[PDB]
Amino acid sequence: TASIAQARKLVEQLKMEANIDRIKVSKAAADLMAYCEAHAKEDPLLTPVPASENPFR
Amino acid sequence: YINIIMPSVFGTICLLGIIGNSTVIFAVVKKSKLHWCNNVPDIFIINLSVVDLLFLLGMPFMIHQLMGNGVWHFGETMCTLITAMDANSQFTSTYILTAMAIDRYLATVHPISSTKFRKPSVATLVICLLWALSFISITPVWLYARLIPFPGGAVGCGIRLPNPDTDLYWFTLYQFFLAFALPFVVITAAYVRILQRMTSSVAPASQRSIRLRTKRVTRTAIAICLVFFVCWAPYYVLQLTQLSISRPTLTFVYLYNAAISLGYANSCLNPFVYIVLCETFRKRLVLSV
Amino acid sequence: DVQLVESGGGLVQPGGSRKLSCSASGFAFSSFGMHWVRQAPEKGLEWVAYISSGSGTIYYADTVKGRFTISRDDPKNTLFLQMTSLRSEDTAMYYCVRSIYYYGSSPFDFWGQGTTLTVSDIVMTQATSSVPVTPGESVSISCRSSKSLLHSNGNTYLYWFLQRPGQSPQLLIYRMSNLASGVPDRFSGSGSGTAFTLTISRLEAEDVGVYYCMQHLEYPLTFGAGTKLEL
Amino acid sequence: DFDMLRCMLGRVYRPCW
Amino acid sequence: TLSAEDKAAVERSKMIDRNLREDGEKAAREVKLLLLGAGESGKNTIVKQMKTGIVETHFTFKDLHFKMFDVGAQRSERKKWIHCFEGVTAIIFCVALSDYDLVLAEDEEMNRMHASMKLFDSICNNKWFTDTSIILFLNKKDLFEEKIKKSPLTICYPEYAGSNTYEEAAAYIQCQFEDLNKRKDTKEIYTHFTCSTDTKNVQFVFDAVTDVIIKNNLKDCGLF
Amino acid sequence: SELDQLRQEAEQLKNQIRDARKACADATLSQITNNIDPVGRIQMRTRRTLRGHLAKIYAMHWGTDSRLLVSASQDGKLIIWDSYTTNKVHAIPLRSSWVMTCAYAPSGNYVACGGLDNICSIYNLKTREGNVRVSRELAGHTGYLSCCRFLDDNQIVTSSGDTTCALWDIETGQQTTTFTGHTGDVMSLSLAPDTRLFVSGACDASAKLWDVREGMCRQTFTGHESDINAICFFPNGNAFATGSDDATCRLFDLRADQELMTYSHDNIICGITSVSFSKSGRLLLAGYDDFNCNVWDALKADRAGVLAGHDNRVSCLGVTDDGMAVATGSWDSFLKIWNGSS
């Protein structure tokens, strides 16, 4: 009775994942895009810092 | 044409061998994880390249008395120093090449028993000992390297033996034995014994991999032994010939200077033998480029 | 537990020789650099010698260089100070100090109980010899240095040590700002350039003692005169 | 451009005999 | 331009290199072997003659230290952790000769020998074992001679059309595994016949490892 | 009968989830970020080369100070590096040389490691004896250890090849929670910035979002065609990226519960071993099997740069907490610190 027990758990798990709230992709895509714009200046790899402030001269 | 052919031959060898030797030195340095840790072959291959680089950097200071006007322009103090430095680089490179073949013999014929003493610390001591032995082997060179007054107003750096009638023989023979004959016997003996013992008895000879292994190593042992012979036999054959010769002719002078270039070409061809015939080094070099 | 027991001190005649030993237990003695610091009677601390981990680096004080010799025996976990031609100026209590050096480490964190020997240069200044204090009252202790202790890497090599009466010096602040492990958070170190201050908020009875400032920017290491807090 | 009939010993000249 | 403490940190770091160098040279003089083989194929019997997740076994034979690693307890996907052994001296693969007429306990339809051949070909032709020599052990050769008398080899290999004798059937199985070597240039396969009372099993591995050591030395020295 | 009916209901639930994801897929991340300017060419130079490892490097982790890092190699050594000066602060000999992961405690007092031995070993870096000693060995996984991450000095989450992730209490040495639901070997995990959730990628080509406190699976993400080898959280914790064997990197959103963008190129046919984000999340750095590390524009799916300085497969990489530098380990036994110049 291992297969029948596993089937109940899998069905029960999918119910929990199917009852979550999902926002639109445009809303979710905007948040990732807006996050980078706010933190763009303080990203040394994206915008290299002057050699004076670079710990790895 | 004579005044343009000879400078071009030396210049091509000097530039081509500098590029090859600097490439070998740079590549061995960039691949070092821990210094003096399980890199005995790399220690020999980088010390042989340093001496070969020295043998070519000092080449133009020794040949400028052969092409232009046959005049030494550096004085008697530099004549002794440059002649001794040039002779040391030839003897040191030959000794390191000989020791790099004994190292390969031990790494192959005795793969288990040689792990006790094939240490990078021991390899460094051996190479430092080769320089010390090379200095002893060039002692007659700098004790007699003086200026020679040629007919006319020109002087040249050369060897002034105390008894040139009788001392000319031991000077040539001892350099022939230590720098050409003895190393070639050891280098040839080491590589032929490697080819006879490069596989364990349990290895399946019928398999293509074992046969292919012997084929590549055989053509590498031949190339190493042949390049040393071809680049130094004419230099030391004419060296023994001139013992009987009293008044050299133009053809002998041209052949002697051509043979001198071949000796310098040995330091130009050693780095490329390792670059071409080593798949691991060759593939890694291409990746960088 | 970490322990450093010194031995070999005692009464010696002028011009004689004496051997000082420091047996280490409870820590990796071979991974620590070891110092000798002496203290003349009714005087401040005085650095003597230093040997690094692996015995690769050895430093001596100019007042004892050429006469004192420092060595270590890592297998036996013992530190040695060979002293020859002892003078009346060598009468002091000699301490065994451990100090490990890597990024983020706290050197001079543990000091030995010291041994007594009796014989028959950045300047650190602590002008205030004594400060009358009361429990529960905030106290500030000032130290000065001839040269700026701030290095180009950002570290300010100033160390604070408290020597309670009858006890060995104990590290409070290392590199002028960091609080040593096992020290109450009320101790704080503040400074800039050549002037530094040690702040003791809510002073207690255990804080009574002499406070020394040491420099570690370059050798020889030099101690201040010492600021004594008394009730 | 010179009289290149000088005797040689190694890579340096020698006085002819 | 290092401070008094920066210089001591550098000396500490070089002291660490002094110990990594000491340990690294000691590690390069030891032999690492990966022991593979299906269940009930004599793999555990080899350990009994050459005495967590991975079971590491050490033994010394003629001044040479071997580290043999058994990963039989790793029931996870082989391809994920198999690259962790890229660089071992050799791979010891155990195949049961007597398990040619038998079938797998679970599948009950796939022959045991075919399972080993698929397993061997997945290991020999694996991209991480391109130049890793494989020591192929054909265990239980005495029991194979008994089965070949009663059960013909044609059950396992329909294409086999040889004599019903050990001296010919065993060689056919040996050639089939060596035929699975998709790269007969960068690696070699060492085949040996073991048994439950054979005392030459450790010698064969010593000889095969010696040939691998020579091959590695030739590559390092630049001869290859 | 009953078993057949239940498995039919599972398919309906899977179809319901797929329809829900399609309903909210009004736009595409590429369409949204089509207007923004590209980042241009990202040029990074090898500032430091960390030498001393004598075997393949499988994992590295930055400290929270952005200066100290720990790297794990299969020479049996766990080395702590001062990236500023290339000094080796510590060298920890590992009992098992088959280490597949390493971790650095956010407090900086502990490091973790684990491999084919099925054990997560905790090492104490701050001892009065002055040496690094083993403080804990976490036993209970039945497969190899693939990734581990500290939450604090007492809690650590580990993934294993036994298809399970476990939350451990370091003080007692017992796993308080077990996260089950994967059908394949879990290869990596990434803790959220608030350490209340974590994502994991397994060999079943699926990613799962787990609740650390509750101990259950919240969301499951699919789309990869092969085993997921790397996974990393976005800086805000609302997204994560995975790197699989199908030569593709994909970005998933937790709230959207579906994939947003794929990072692949036709010339790239090798697997992906490690992924990481820059401080702002604009750059997605991914290590590949072709001996190179490609920098990806996470918003535009463009290869902004290449970190090509390794002679073997790039097995690990990480970006500092301040975004100043990125380190890459590789099977050539070298770690390289990369950052750009003005």
B65 and D9 within 8 Å at the Cβ level: the answer is no
| C155 close contact with E: CB closer than 8 A | yes
- Identify the closest residue of chain C to E18 by CA–CA distance: C54
Sheet holding F57-62, edge to edge: F57-62, F68-73, F77-82, F87-93
Which tokens is B246 given?
């009293």
Residue F241's CB is within 10 A of a number of other CB atoms, namely 28
- Identify the closest residue of chain F to A49 by CA–CA distance: F342
Within the 16-45 window of chain A, which residues sit less than 8 Å (CB to CB) from chain F?
Answer: 16-18, 20-33, 35-36, 39-40, 42-45
Integer Cα distance of F318 and F71 in angstroms:
11
For chain D, list residues whose CB is within 8 angstroms of any CB belonging to chain B. Answer: 1-17
Q: Residue A28 belongs to what domain range?
A: 3-57
Least CB-CB distance to E64: which of B103, B112, B213? B112
Q: Which residues, other chains included, contact B263 with Cβ-Cβ below 8 Å and sequence gap of 6+?
A: B90, B231, B232, B235, D11
| DSSP letters for F85-146 | TTEEEEEEE-S-S-EEEEEE-TTSSEEEEEETT--EEEEES--TTSS-EEEEEE---SS-EE
Residue pair F159/F200 in contact by the 8 Å Cβ criterion: yes
B neighbour chains, 3+ CB pairs within 8 Å:
D, E, F
- Identify the closest residue of chain B to E65 by CA–CA distance: B112
Q: Which long-range contacts (CB under 8 A, 24 or more apart) does B172-178 make?
A: B172/B239, B172/B240, B172/B243, B172/D9, B174/B140, B175/B239, B175/D10, B176/B236, B176/B239, B176/B240, B178/B91, B178/B137
Q: List CB contacts (< 8 A) between E7 and chain C.
A: 57
Integer Cα distance of B104 and B252 in angstroms:
39
Q: How far apart are the CA of C189 and the nearest CA of chain E, in angstroms?
A: 20
> Which residues sit opposite F87 in a β-bridge?
F82
Integer Cα distance of D7 and F55 in angstroms:
59
Integer Cα distance of B78 and B82 in angstroms:
6
Give the domain CATH number at A25. 4.10.260.10
Q: How far is CA F289 from CA A28, B255, C38, E130, F101, in A?
A: 31, 56, 60, 16, 18
Amino acid at E135: I
Integer Cα distance of E1 and C44 in angstroms:
31
Q: Is B56 helix (H, G, I), strand (E, B) or coil?
A: helix
Which tokens is C94 given?
């000699």
Q: List CB contacts (< 8 A) between B164 and chain D.
A: 14-15, 17
E222 and B277 within 8 Å at the Cβ level: the answer is yes
F neighbour chains, 3+ CB pairs within 8 Å:
A, B, C, E
Integer Cα distance of F120 and F114 in angstroms:
5
Q: How far apart are the CA of F336 and the nearest CA of chain C, in angstroms?
A: 20
Q: How far is CA F27 from CA A3, A27, A28, F31, F256, in A?
A: 40, 9, 10, 7, 11
Exposure string for B7-28, b = 16+ CB within 10 A, e = fewer: eebbeebbebbbebbebbbebb
Least CB-CB distance to D5: which of B141, B161, B253? B253
Helix, strand, coil share of chain F (percent; to 5): 10, 45, 45
Which tokens is B117 given?
């003493």
Sign, CA dihedral B74-B75-B81-B86, equals positive
Integer Cα distance of F301 and A29 in angstroms:
13
| C217 close contact with E: CB closer than 8 A | yes
> Where is chain F discontinuous (C–N over 2.5 Å), named by the preceding residue?
none
Q: Of F132, F140, F152, which is closest to residue F114 (Cα–Cα)?
A: F140
| F226 close contact with E: CB closer than 8 A | no
For chain E, list residues whose CB is within 8 angstroms of any CB belonging to chain F. Answer: 6, 9-10, 12-13, 16-17, 19-20, 23-24, 27, 52-54, 69, 71, 74-77, 80-81, 84, 86-87
Q: How far apart are the CA of B135 and the nearest CA of chain E, in angstroms?
A: 27
Integer Cα distance of B234 and B222 in angstroms:
18
Residue pair F91/F79 in contact by the 8 Å Cβ criterion: yes
Q: Is C119 exposed, middle or buried (0-12, 13-18, 19+ CB in 10 A)?
A: middle
Cis before residue C220, ω within 30 degrees of 0? yes
| A53 close contact with F: CB closer than 8 A | no
Q: List CB contacts (< 8 A) between E204 and chain B.
A: 202
Integer Cα distance of B7 and B2 in angstroms:
9
Q: How far apart are the CA of F87 and the nearest CA of chain B, in angstroms?
A: 14
Q: Is F117 exposed, middle or buried (0-12, 13-18, 19+ CB in 10 A)?
A: buried
∠ Cα F176 F180 F181 (to 5°)? 165
Integer Cα distance of F63 and F318 in angstroms:
10
Amino acid at C133: V
Q: List CB contacts (< 8 A) between E29 and chain B.
A: 115
Name the CA radius of gyration of chain E, rounded. Answer: 21
Residue pair C217/C206 in contact by the 8 Å Cβ criterion: no
B34 and F54 within 8 Å at the Cβ level: the answer is yes
Integer Cα distance of F318 and F70 in angstroms:
11
Q: How far apart are the CA of F97 and the nearest CA of chain B, in angstroms?
A: 18
Q: Of F84, F93, F83, F87, which is closest to residue F60 (Cα–Cα)?
A: F83
Q: Is E20 helix (H, G, I), strand (E, B) or coil?
A: helix
Q: How far is CA B44 from CA B27, E115, F119, in A?
A: 14, 48, 43
Helices (H), chain F: 2-23, 29-32
* CA-based max dimension of chain B: 73
Instruction: Scan for tokens 């053809």, then name that residue.
Output: B251
Residue pair B136/B70 in contact by the 8 Å Cβ criterion: no
| F74 close contact with E: CB closer than 8 A | yes
Q: List CB contacts (< 8 A) between B284 and chain F.
A: 311
| F250 close contact with E: CB closer than 8 A | no
Q: Is B37 helix (H, G, I), strand (E, B) or coil?
A: coil
Q: How far apart are the CA of E24 and the nearest CA of chain B, in angstroms?
A: 7
Which tokens is C157 given?
């090599």
Residue B30's CB is within 10 A of a number of other CB atoms, namely 12
Sheet holding F186-191, edge to edge: F186-191, F197-202, F206-211, F217-222
Residue pair E74/E63 in contact by the 8 Å Cβ criterion: no
Q: List CB contacts (< 8 A) between B87 and chain D.
A: 10-11
Q: Beta strands C78-84 and E55-60: pairing type?
A: unpaired
Q: How far is CA E216 from CA B212, E131, E222, in A?
A: 15, 10, 10
Least CB-CB distance to C157: which of E1, E5, E11? E5
Counted residue by residue, chain C has a size of 231
Secondary structure letter of residue E160 according to DSSP: -
Instruction: Scan for tokens 């710990």, then name that residue.
Output: A55
Where residue B56 falls (left for φ over 0; alpha for ψ -120 to 50; beta otherwise) is: alpha
Outline where DSSP puts E strands in F203-257.
206-211, 217-222, 228-233, 239-244, 249-253
Residue pair C47/C220 in contact by the 8 Å Cβ criterion: yes
Least CB-CB distance to B213: which of E62, E191, E215? E215
Which tokens is F44 given?
């990074």
Residue pair B238/B16 in contact by the 8 Å Cβ criterion: no
Sign, CA dihedral F264-F265-F269-F274, equals negative
Exposure string for B120-135, b = 16+ CB within 10 A, e = fewer: beebeebbeebeeebe
Experimental method: cryo-EM
Instruction: Report how far Cα C169 is from the mean position of its chain's Cα atoms.
Output: 7
Residue pair F313/F271 in contact by the 8 Å Cβ criterion: no
Residue pair F87/E9 in contact by the 8 Å Cβ criterion: yes
- Identify the closest residue of chain F to E86 by CA–CA distance: F56
Q: Of B86, C116, E74, which is closest to residue D10 (Cα–Cα)?
A: B86
Residue pair F257/A20 in contact by the 8 Å Cβ criterion: yes
Q: How far apart are the CA of F174 and the nearest CA of chain A, in angstroms?
A: 25
Residue B274's CB is within 10 A of a number of other CB atoms, namely 25
Q: Is F307 helix (H, G, I), strand (E, B) or coil?
A: strand
Resolution stated for this PDB structure, in Å: 2.8
Q: List CB contacts (< 8 A) between E21 and chain C.
A: none
Q: How far apart are the CA of E6 and the nearest CA of chain C, in angstroms?
A: 8
Q: Which residues, other chains included, contact C76 with Cβ-Cβ below 8 Å and sequence gap of 6+?
A: none
Integer Cα distance of E176 and F273 in angstroms:
36
Helix (H) or strand (E) holding E205: helix E201-221
Q: Of B239, B250, B202, B268, which is closest to residue B53 (Cα–Cα)?
A: B268
Q: How far apart are the CA of B275 and the nearest CA of chain D, in angstroms?
A: 29
Secondary structure letter of residue B223 according to DSSP: H
Q: How far apart are the CA of B287 and the nearest CA of chain F, in angstroms?
A: 8
Integer Cα distance of F70 and F91 in angstroms:
9
Integer Cα distance of D13 and B63 in angstroms:
11
Integer Cα distance of F316 and F333 in angstroms:
11
F53 and B33 within 8 Å at the Cβ level: the answer is yes
Secondary structure letter of residue E158 according to DSSP: T
The structural domain count of chain A equals 1
Helix (H) or strand (E) holding F24: none
Residue pair C45/C161 in contact by the 8 Å Cβ criterion: yes
Q: Of F290, F292, F288, F279, which is closest to residue F326 (Cα–Cα)?
A: F279
Sheet holding F145-150, edge to edge: F145-150, F155-160, F164-169, F174-180
Q: Beta strands C195-200 and F155-160: pairing type?
A: unpaired
Residue pair C182/C204 in contact by the 8 Å Cβ criterion: no
Chains C and E touch each other (3 or more Cβ pairs < 8 A): yes
Integer Cα distance of F172 and F139 in angstroms:
12
E185 and B209 within 8 Å at the Cβ level: the answer is yes
Q: How far is CA B229 from CA B53, B188, B238, E16, in A?
A: 20, 10, 14, 46
